[PDB]
Design a protein around this nucleic acid. Sequence first.
RNA 1: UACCUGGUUGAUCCUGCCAGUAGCAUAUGCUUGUCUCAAAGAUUAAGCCAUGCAUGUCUAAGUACGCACGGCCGGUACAGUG
Length: 50
Amino acid sequence: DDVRQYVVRKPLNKEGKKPRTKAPKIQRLVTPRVLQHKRRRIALKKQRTK
RNA sequence: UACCUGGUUGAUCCUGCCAGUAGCAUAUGCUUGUCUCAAAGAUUAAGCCAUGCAUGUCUAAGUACGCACGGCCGGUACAGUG
């Protein structure tokens, strides 16, 4: 199930500006970038043994 | 430039120290147009201190839901500045 689906969103309704909603940056979220970093670390191990 | 002048005796020479003389430091006095460098609360009290300042710091790369601002496109977690 998707954690990013269920984020607690915060409204923002101040006069003189457009009413908008903010959401936080989710931490400890698996993304392609952390997986790419993991692959890079294992690659560094590979070249060191070679 | 390895230089001298004077002072004891009625007069001569000498030992001898002193005064003058030149440099360096500090202080001070009088005077003082221009320009270039430039020391400067050590000496006496490592005495005592009013007030202000003398040490802070962010990149693409630790943490951003402060609308403090700010475009989306709209379920697009997080634009970006901060």
